Structure formats: structure tokens, C-alpha cells
């Protein structure tokens, strides 16, 4: 089984990358667009995708499977600030006195799915945390530029922000977040340029 380990001690946490084809070779610098085969140092198995169960699984097997590494983010990070994809943040609406959040004190998703501006300790509670997810898997940890579409996921409830005509803003689940209603953009100014 392939899982997570707290400590780096031992060779179980180490994997060796090998080319999936003859175009690459040992010692050659790995390109971002490539297919790799990963071998566990401890067991000499492969990071393998198994079809045996009704649902696909991942396991360290002797049959080798091709894995493609996709970059997300790098060490640039634009120093401080400069919002990047995947960031968890608070949307301060007014003059540093309100946050976009949902009710939680009432309890119950039926009234927790609504969205509103609230002030006070909401700015330090986890209830007012939204993570910004880009629409592209590759380079999803890059800087967010003006007009770039994204989704806003309420971290605590796990539901995505969305717009429908009859009841304006609302949160739905992963199965109902269908980009047509959950996509939002940041604009420098409100004019319809």
C-alpha cells in the first residue's frame, strides 16, 4: 500500500524516478512535461494503478505505470503578497470591518449555505476562510492575474460559491459546482471595459 509517513528515516520514503521511454536517459535533466516511472527504494515496486477493484486504486506493485509530473508552483512566490492560486484568504469588503462568510451559530446546512457580510470576531474565526482554486490543473499555484476565472471554496463547509438567478449567492457541493455558476473573476475597476 502507498501512504504517508511522518518521518523520513529509512528508504521507504524515497523513490527513484526512471524514464518511461528511450528519449530520456540516466543523468538527463527531467523536463516538466514527461512520463516517469517511480520505484520504491525499500520494496523495489512501482507506483502502480490497479484496476482490480470496482474503483481504481494506487499500490506499490511489480507492474509499472507511467506517471506524468505536472508543475504547480515554484520558489519565486513574488516575495510577500501577490495572490497566488490555491491561497486561503478572507475577503474584507468594507473599511477593514467586515468579511464575506456564512452563518454557523444557527447550525444546519440549510441556513449555513447562505452568504453574507459580517463583522467582529469572524475575521479571526475559521468560518470566514475561502480558498481560491484556478480552473487549470497545471500551474494552478501561479500568480492570479486580473480577469482570471477561479472558484471560491468555503474551507470549513467544503462547499463552492455559486450564483443562481432566484436566490443569488449560494454554496453547492462538488457534484453541483459546474464552472458555469461557480466561476468568478477579480477586476481592478468596475467599468465594463
Amino acid at each position: 500500500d502507498v501512504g504517508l509517513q511522518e518521518d523520513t528515516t529509512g528508504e521507504a520514503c524515497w523513490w527513484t524516478i526512471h524514464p518511461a521511454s528511450k528519449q530520456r536517459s540516466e543523468g538527463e535533466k527531467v523536463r516538466v512535461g514527461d512520463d516517469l516511472i517511480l520505484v520504491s527504494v525499500s520494496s523495489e515496486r512501482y507506483l502502480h494503478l490497479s484496476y482490480g477493484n470496482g474503483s481504481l486504486h494506487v499500490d506499490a506493485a511489480f507492474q509499472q505505470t507511467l506517471w506524468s509530473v505536472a508543475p504547480i508552483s515554484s520558489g519565486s512566490e513574488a516575495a510577500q503578497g501577490y495572490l497566488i492560486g490555491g491561497d486561503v484568504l478572507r475577503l474584507l469588503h468594507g473599511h477593514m470591518d467586515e468579511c464575506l462568510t456564512v452563518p454557523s451559530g444557527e447550525h444546519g446546512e440549510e441556513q449555513r449555505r447562505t452568504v453574507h457580510y459580517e463583522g467582529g470576531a469572524v475575521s479571526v474565526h475559521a468560518r470566514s476562510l475561502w480558498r481560491l482554486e484556478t480552473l487549470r490543473v497545471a500551474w494552478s499555484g501561479s500568480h492570479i492575474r486580473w480577469g482570471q476565472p477561479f472558484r471560491l471554496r468555503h474551507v470549513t463547509t467544503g462547499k463552492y460559491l455559486s450564483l443562481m438567478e432566484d436566490k443569488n449567492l449560494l454554496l453547492m457541493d462538488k457534484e453541483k459546482a459546474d464552472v458555469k455558476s461557480t466561476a468568478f473573476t477579480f477586476r481592478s475597476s468596475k467599468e465594463k471595459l
Binding site: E11, S42, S43, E44, G52, F62, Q63
Partner: protein, 978 residues
């Protein structure tokens, strides 16, 4: 060679094939081919044969190999050429590559073993470290790919010949695995560089492991072996069914493939020294092998039993064909893998494996000890497998046998089976030596007290002093040398315990039997050199003041054992016993209890109620109250209890009527409810009762089954074995119903007791002591030795230098004297004990015992007087014995309470010493300037001085001079002083 070289230039055909086969035969017949391998290599014969092979294989490469006889003969010639010399092997190694592509030329066709290009390739690297290390990864990769193809696709020619179309090719896979085994294992050591590569390639291609072990729905190795056995014993799936020849026995093929794979992996397993050092690659390989093969599968495969050869009517042996069924070589590989990868490091696992997988095989091999059945293929193969795989494993795992007090029955059965197998014939010298080493190490590690059954078995067998007696003799020597404190010391060895006087009587019988047999046996060098230490060790182990029980335990365990046959069931006759009427109440009550318990068990099984008495509708028992049961139904319960009571009375144990319980019970739809009874306790004597009477019942059943056997005309039922050799689970039923009957006796209170008592207390310790008897025999033998030496002095001086009593004198000089020396050196304090307490255990040898010690000392002195040259090198032995006896002499007590003849002999010893010293006086005087003089001088200087020195040192140390040296002995001492 010129004929073959000329045939190179003509196209191959039938005539040329015949000519070249004959030429190769002539060459392999010639002397120079074997005497001068360098000449052969210089002439390049291997290259010529390889060119012929290439031509034949290329002819019809796509088709079947034309002229297979030519290929087989060339392969055989090249294999022999490789075997001739190492440089020939290295020269043929250069053609390894081509042979690897052409490996599959004739693998599937049988009767070509050792006559294939794969066989030539294997011989090119067999038992050669340089060539094994020179093997390359692509060379092993080709073989791995071929094995994967064999494991994935069936054999075309095999299926064309009508064989069932299984999905894989065990026949060729086995040969590929054998070649890989030769590649990875060389000269008894595993080439780690090749083993790692082979393991990595095999795990990269998991199809190489066959249907089973492939995963993804593949069943276990045990299941695969069982299914292959079913195929082997089921026709229409094993052969084609439209000298093996066409027959392949696909079940055996599958089994052999799996065995070869297991053997190859076990040889690829890393070394334990590397594992201990911590080579991460070694631990990784071991973990991989453990993941592939579970331990339980190996245990189950080992537990699988063979098919014993059967003796049928008219004395005909039916031995199932080895090449068609399950073979011990298949389990040998499993044992090898279990030892190499998993190993045996914990006592509980060792005992479990011994009980489930090894003990049945050992018992079967021991059972196959009949003269006719001991030469069968199964018997020889099983003996080879045992002595080459199983027994060395137990020898190496001997230290794990330390804390085995609980599983006494299991390892007693192990010891009995091993000893019987050793006694069996048709065993090679190496196999017998392996048996000896295994038994020695095992018995050395086990506890002294609980090998009593093996001691008892050896007692009846070793006095014969046959060729096989060497191993039991050494076994007894080592055991009694190690565990002497268990017997001699009254407290015992410690936590081990103390002898129960049964071991003491057994050891005394063994000692006396061995002594008598050696006395009457003609002198043999090795036999005596082995027997004397055994006799000394047994004498030292036995307490000197041991009291021999004049009455033996009634019907002691000699009836169960037999001469030669070693197993004659002897149930006690029940004809003359009459059951007392007072036991009828117990018979009735126990019948009621048994019927109620059986009704409970029947309802618990859940079977249709007994509403009528129906046979086919199978409603037989009626579960009706015992009082309502018929008299003939009562018989099936009463008769076993009747026989039980018959044996109880026959064995002389009283059962008396507890007054309280007897009066107590006398005044005291259907409910089958009975008594929870298993919670009752039994004493030690009660437990021994239950064990011996369950043994009698097992003997009864074994005898009945035996008469059934000769009624059928033959056979050997697996459990027809002595009760001691019978294992715990197999003794469980008899022991349980023993517990049942004794417990019901106890709960009724019916008091069972030993009954027949000792006829007399036997206070004459002075007469019945083991030391008393031993010293009587010793002094007697010294007396005949003395009379023989006077006969020699009478005869040899005239004419009789050679005397008829050579073997008697050799016995006395080789066995008697060292036995005396060792016995009195071990037990010096015992004979020297007196009113004072130099020893703390109690000792205190009798006055008569001390008297005979003195008499023996005097007899030995008289014997040695002027006869050192007659004994030659033994004179050292005589003087050592006299030294020890003089140290052990209890002069004060002997002179206070002793017999006049012995006292006079002790005085005469000193008088003779004084007279000899005076004679030496006149020999040295007036003879220093210029024969009996030399004899007296060297006799004095060699023997007389040490004896007097030791005796006087002992007397001075123990202050015996004030009690011994008085009057005439003072006069003799004055002469000695002058």
C-alpha cells in the same frame, strides 16, 4: 576426429548421422579424451561439435529439429567435455550465448535429460565460481524471458500429443528454473550478485511463477500442490488419453515446477551473516521472498503426506510410480526455502512444524523398516530426503529444545522414531552418521528426566553389542556424563528434579547388562574404547548407596517391546478375573452416565430424534431413559466397563468401598442432562494409573487392528505404533476416557489403591547395595585375574608364552581397571565417610563395603607385586588404581570393625612392601660395581614407591596411624623406615 571433420563437409542425413554418432561414441570411449583434455581443446573438438550442432539446428530452424538424435549426442558429448576439466568448461563457456537462444530445442521432449543445449549451457557454468560471476544480466534475461513465455503459453507439441490444454508449460519451466538454480548457486554457496539479478528479473516478470503465486486470483501454493496431486491420481487429466516416453504425468510436472521455483528462490535467499550485518539489499530480498511465499503454504505442503508402498496378498509389494505422484524431493525444496528465508528461531514454531510436518514423515520412514519394503523407491527417497534436509535442520535447531517440558509426548515420539529409523537397515553410512549426529545433539539438549523412555528402549537393545550399538553407547555416555547430578545427588540437579527410582532401577539394569555383555564379548578395539567410558559414566551416575528394589514393578514395560520386532501388543488376559458383585452398582451408574452423555452429544450434533427404532430412517438410539432401555442395549455400555474392571482387578490395584459414599448413594418428557465431569482432579498415582490403563487399551486396539491386517494379508496402519511413540492428539481419546473412568470412580468415592505391597522393607542395605554388588564382582574378577597370572607364571617360563586366556586378560586390563579407577575417583568421599561427615549428602559406606575396598586394594597389590613387565603398559593402570584405592582406604573403621582375613591381608601388604624394600637393599648394596636385580630395582622404582607414598600421605592426612600402625605393622614400618 578426422571422420567427424570430414562429415562436416557433407550435408547431414541418416547415414552421416549414424557415422557421426558412432565417431562420437568411439571418441568418448577412447582413453586420450579423458587423459589429455588439453590435447582435445587444442584440436578444437568442441568447436567441431558446435559447428555440427549449428548446422543441424539451422536445418529446419522454423520446423521441428531434424535428426534429434544428432543434437542429443552432440549435447551429451559437449556436457562430458565440460565435465572433463575446468579449462574445457571455460572454453565451452564462450558459446553460452548461442546455446541460450537454442535452449528450447528439446526441453519438452523427455528422455533427453542432460542432452539439450540448455543442459550444455548449465554444464558450462556448473560448480564454477569464475564462470558464475562472469554470467551477465542479458544472459540471465534471456532465460527469464523464456521462463515467462513457458509460464504464459502452453506447450504446442504437448497439446498436439493429446495432453490437456492447461495454460502454462511446467515441463520447460522446470528446466529453465534448474538452469537458473545452477546460475545462482555454486559449490554449496549462493552467488549473491547473480541471485539479486535473478530475483529482480523474476519479480519484474511475475508470470514466471505460474498460475499460482501470480496473484490477481491465483490460489495459494498449497492449493496448487493439492490440485496437482488430484490431477496426478486422476487419469484423463494427467496423461494424453487420446521409461516415461510419451507419458509426462502433468501433475508431477506441475509439482516439480513449483518445487524447482521454491528451491531456486530459497537458494537466492541472502545469507544470515549478511542479514545480521544489515545489508539493506539483503533485507530487501528476504522481505520480497517472504511476501511472495507465505509461511503457512510451506507448512501445509510439508504437512502433506506421501503414498506408502503396500504389501498385498501373496507377499507382493505395490509401490506407486514415483514419477507419477508426490515425491519427497518436492518437500525437500520447501524445507530448504523455509530454512533459508523464514528460518526456525522460536521453540513453539519449531515444535508445531515438527508435529505437523516432520514427525509423520519420520514415523512413515520408521514403519517402512520391513526387509521387503526397505528397498522400495519410496522408502529410499524418503530416507534420503529425511537425512539430507530434515534431520540436519533439527540438528542446527537443537538449542531451541531447551524449554520443552510441556511437549514431552511429541519429542519422545521424535526420539523413538529416530532411534527406530537408525536401527533400520538399508541406510548408507552418511545417512546413519547424520542420524547419529541429530540424535546426539537433540538428546544432549533435552532434559535428563524426560528421556526416560529412550533410556528404557536402549536398555533392551544396546547389550547386544552389535555394529549398530555404537550410537546408543555414545548417547548413554554423553547423557550420563552431562546429567550425573540428577541421579547421585539426593536433592537432584536443581529445578530439573530427581530420579524417581524407576530411572535408577533402569540404569542399574543397563549397567549390569552392558558389563556382562562386555565381559562375555570377544575383544574389539573401538567397541571397548566406547563401552568403557559408558560403563564409567553409568557407575558414576548411579548413587553408591543405591538400594536395588528386590521386586520389580509388576508387568514393567518389557511386554510392549519385542525382540527384533520391537512391537508385540500384549493385552492382559481377562478370563480368570471375576467381577465382584459390589461393583455392579458402579457398572449400572456409569452406564447411566454414559448413556446420558451420549444422548446429550447426539442432540448437540442435532440428529433426528429417536421416535422409533428405524434403520434406513436412521432413528436408531431412541434417546430413551436408561431404566427404560432394554437389557441388550445395556450390553454395549456394560461390556466396556466390564473389560475396564477386569483389567483393573488383573493389575492388582484394590478398589475398596468408601463407606460414606456407599451409604450416601444407597439412601440417595426426557431430560438427557448429564454431569459436567472434566473439572475433577487426579493425583500423581491416579494419573499414572490412567496413563498405563489407556496404554493397555491402545495395545488392545493395536492388536485387533493387527489381526485385521494379516487377515487382509498385508499393510501397515500409520498409528500401529508403541504407546510411548504415539503422539498427544492420537493418545487424546484413550487418555480422555481413562480420565473419565478414573474420575467417575473418584466422584463415587470408590477408593482405588495400589494394593499389592512390598513383601519386606529390605533393611539389609549391606547386602543389597549397588556398591556392594559392584565391589563383589570386581574383587571376584581380580581373583580370577590373579589365578590366571599364577597360571601364566607356571606355564610361560617353561613353554607357554602364549596363553589361552588372552581375551580374559584383555578384558581385565582394558575394562576392569579403568572402571575401578573412575568409580573410586568419583566416589572417594563416599567410601571414606565415617562417623565424621566429610560428605554432606549422607553417604556413609557400610563397614562391609570398606572391608571389601581394603580387600580389593590388597588383591591389587598382590597382583602387581613383581609383575609390572607382565602387564607392560598396563602397569600404569594398576599403579593408578592402587593409588586411588589407597587414597580411599578407610583404615581406622576397617581395623575397628573388620574381618580377620582382610585385616591380615592389609598387614601382609605392608609386610611384603618391607620385605621387597629389604631385598632392594641387598641388591643395591655390594652390587654397585657389578638378572632378578634389574627386575626388583625397576619394579620398586616404578610401582612400590608411589603406592607407599600415596598410602602414607592418606594415613597422615586422616590421622589413621594411631589406629592402624600398631604392633607387627609398626615393626614392618620400622623396617620400611630403615
Amino acid at each position: 576426429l578426422g571422420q567427424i571433420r570430414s562429415l562436416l563437409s557433407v550435408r547431414m542425413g541418416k547415414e552421416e548421422e549414424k557415422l557421426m554418432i558412432r565417431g562420437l561414441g568411439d571418441i568418448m570411449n577412447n582413453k586420450v579424451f579423458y587423459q589429455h583434455p588439453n590435447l582435445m581443446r587444442a584440436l578444437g573438438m568442441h568447436e567441431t561439435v558446435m559447428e555440427v550442432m549449428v548446422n543441424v539446428l539451422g536445418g529446419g530452424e522454423s520446423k521441428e529439429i531434424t535428426f534429434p538424435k544428432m543434437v542429443a549426442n552432440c549435447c551429451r558429448f559437449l556436457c562430458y567435455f565440460c565435465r572433463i576439466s575446468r579449462q574445457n568448461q571455460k572454453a565451452m563457456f564462450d558459446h553460452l550465448s548461442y546455446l541460450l537462444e537454442n535452449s528450447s530445442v528439446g526441453l519438452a521432449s523427455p528422455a533427453m535429460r542432460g542432452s539439450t543445449p540448455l543442459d550444455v549451457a548449465a554444464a558450462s557454468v556448473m560448480d564454477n565460481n569464475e564462470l558464475a560471476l562472469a554470467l551477465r544480466e542479458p544472459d540471465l534475461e534471456k532465460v527469464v524471458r523464456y521462463l515467462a513465455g513457458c509460464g504464459l503459453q502452453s506447450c504446442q507439441m504437448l497439446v498436439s500429443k493429446g495432453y490437456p490444454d492447461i495454460g502454462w508449460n511446467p515441463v520447460e519451466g522446470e528446466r529453465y528454473l534448474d538452469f537458473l538454480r545452477f546460475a545462482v548457486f555454486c559449490n554449496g554457496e549462493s552467488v549473491e550478485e547473480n541471485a539479486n539479478v535473478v530475483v529482480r528479473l523474476l519479480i519484474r516478470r511475475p508470470e514466471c511463477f505460474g498460475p499460482a503465486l501470480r496473484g490477481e486470483g491465483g490460489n495459494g501454493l498449497l492449493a496448487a500442490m493439492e490440485e496437482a496431486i488430484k490431477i496426478a491420481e486422476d487419469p484423463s487429466r494427467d496423461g494424453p488419453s487420446p521409461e516415461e516416453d510419451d507419458t509426462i504425468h502433468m501433475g508431477n510436472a506441475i509439482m516439480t515446477f513449483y518445487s524447482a521455483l521454491i528451491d531456486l528462490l530459497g537458494r537466492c535467499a541472502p545469507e544470515m551473516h549478511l542479514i545480521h550485518a544489515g545489508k539493506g539489499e539483503a533485507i530487501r530480498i528476504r522481505s520480497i521472498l517472504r511476501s511472495l511465499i507465505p509461511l503457512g503454504d510451506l507448512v501445509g505442503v510439508i504437512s502433506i503426506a506421501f503414498q506408502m508402498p503396500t504389501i498385498a496378498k501373496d507377499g507382493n509389494v505395490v509401490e506407486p510410480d514415483m514419477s507419477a505422484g508426490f515425491c519427497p524431493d518436492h518437500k525437500a525444496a520447501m524445507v530448504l526455502f523455509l530454512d533459508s528465508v523464514y528460518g526456525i528461531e522460536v521453540q513453539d514454531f519449531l515444535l508445531h512444524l515438527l508435529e505437523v510436518g516432520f514427525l509423520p514423515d519420520l514415523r512413515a520412514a520408521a514403519s517402512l523398516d520391513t526387509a521387503a519394503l526397505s528397498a522400495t523407491d519410496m522408502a529410499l527417497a524418503l530416507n534420503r530426503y529425511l537425512c539430507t534436509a530434515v534431520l540436519p535442520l533439527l540438528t542446527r535447531c537443537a538449542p531451541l529444545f531447551a524449554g520443552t517440558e510441556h511437549h514431552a509426548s511429541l519429542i519422545d515420539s521424535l526420539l523413538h522414531t529416530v532411534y527406530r529409523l537408525s536401527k533400520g537397515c538399508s541406510l548408507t553410512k552418511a545417512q546413519r552418521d547424520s542420524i547419529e549426529v541429530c540424535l546426539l545433539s537433540i538428546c544432549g539438549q533435552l532434559r535428563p528426566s524426560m528421556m526416560q523412555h529412550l533410556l528404557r528402549r536402549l536398555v533392551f537393545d544396546v547389550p547386544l553389542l552389535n555394529e549398530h550399538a555404537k550410537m546408543p553407547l555414545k548417547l548413554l555416555t554423553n547423557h550420563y556424563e552431562r546429567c550425573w547430578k540428577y541421579y547421585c545427588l539426593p536433592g537432584g540437579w536443581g529445578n530439573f528434579g530427581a530420579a524417581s527410582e524407576e530411572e535408577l532401577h533402569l540404569s542399574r539394569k543397563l549397567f549390569w547388562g552392558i558389563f556382562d555383555a562386555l565381559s562375555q564379548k570377544k575383544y574389539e578395539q573401538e567397541l571397548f574404547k566406547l563401552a568403557l567410558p559408558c560403563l564409567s559414566a553409568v557407575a558414576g551416575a548411579l548413587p553408591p548407596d543405591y538400594m536395588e528394589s528386590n521386586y520389580v514393578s509388576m508387568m514393567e514395560k518389557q511386554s510392549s517391546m519385542d525382540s527384533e520386532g520391537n512391537f508385540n501388543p500384549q493385552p492382559v488376559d481377562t478370563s480368570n478375573i471375576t467381577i465382584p458383585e459390589k461393583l455392579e452398582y458402579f457398572i449400572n451408574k456409569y452406564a447411566e452416565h454414559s448413556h446420558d452423555k451420549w444422548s446429550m452429544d447426539k442432540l448437540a450434533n442435532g440428529w433426528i430424534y429417536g421416535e422409533i427404532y428405524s434403520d434406513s430412517s436412521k432413528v436408531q438410539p431412541l434417546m430413551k431413559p436408561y431404566k427404560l432401555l432394554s437389557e441388550k442395549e445395556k450390553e454395549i455400555y456394560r461390556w466396556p466397563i466390564k473389560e475396564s474392571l477386569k483389567t483393573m482387578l488383573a493389575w492388582g490395584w484394590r478398589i475398596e468401598r468408601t463407606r460414606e459414599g456407599d451409604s450416601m448413594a444407597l439412601y440417595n418428557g426426557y431430560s438427557p442432562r448429564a454431569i459436567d465431569m472434566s473439572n475433577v482432579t487426579l493425583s500423581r498415582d491416579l494419573h499414572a494409573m490412567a496413563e498405563m490403563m489407556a496404554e493397555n487399551y491402545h495395545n488392545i486396539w493395536a492388536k485387533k487392528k493387527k489381526m485385521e491386517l494379516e487377515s487382509k494379508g498385508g499393510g501397515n496402519h500409520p498409528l500401529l505404533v508403541p504407546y510411548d511413540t504415539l503422539t498427544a492428539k492420537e493418545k487424546a481419546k484413550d487418555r480422555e476416557k481413562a480420565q473419565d473412568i478414573l474420575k467417575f470412580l473418584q466422584i463415587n468415592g470408590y477408593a482405588v489403591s495400589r494394593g499389592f505391597k512390598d513383601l519386606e522393607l529390605d533393611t539389609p542395605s549391606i547386602e543389597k547395595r549397588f556398591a556392594y554388588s559392584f565391589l563383589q564382582q570386581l574383587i571376584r574378577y581380580v581373583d580370577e585375574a590373579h589365578q590366571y597370572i599364577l597360571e601364566f607364571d607356571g606355564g610361560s617360563r617353561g613353554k607357554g608364552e602364549h596363553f589361552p586366556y588372552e581375551q580374559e586378560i584383555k578384558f581385565f586390563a582394558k575394562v576392569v581397571l579403568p572402571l575401578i579407577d573412575q568409580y573410586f575417583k568419583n566416589h572417594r568421599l563416599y567410601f571414606l565417610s565415617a562417623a565424621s561427615r566429610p560428605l554432606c549428602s549422607g553417604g556413609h559406606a557400610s563397614n562391609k563395603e570398606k572391608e571389601m575396598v581394603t580387600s580389593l586394594f590388597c588383591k591389587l597389590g598382590v597382583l602387581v607385586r613383581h609383575r609390572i613387565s607382565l602387564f607392560g603398559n598396563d602397569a600404569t593402570s594398576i599403579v593408578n588404581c592402587l593409588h586411588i584405592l589407597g587414597q580411599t582406604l578407610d583404615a581406622r573403621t576397617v581395623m575397628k570393625t573388620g574381618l580377620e582375613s582382610v585385616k591380615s591381608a592389609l598387614r601382609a601388604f605392608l609386610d611384603n612392601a618391607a620385605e621387597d624394600l629389604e631385598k632392594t637393599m641387598e641388591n643395591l648394596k655390594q652390587g654397585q660395581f657389578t638378572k632378578g636385580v634389574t627386575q626388583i630395582i625397576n619394579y620398586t622404582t616404578v610401582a612400590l614407591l608411589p603406592m607407599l607414598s600415596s598410602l602414607f600421605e592418606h594415613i597422615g592426612q586422616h590421622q589413621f596411624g594411631e589406629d592402624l600402625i600398631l604392633e607387627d605393622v609398626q615393626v614392618s614400618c620400622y623396617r620400611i623406615l630403615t
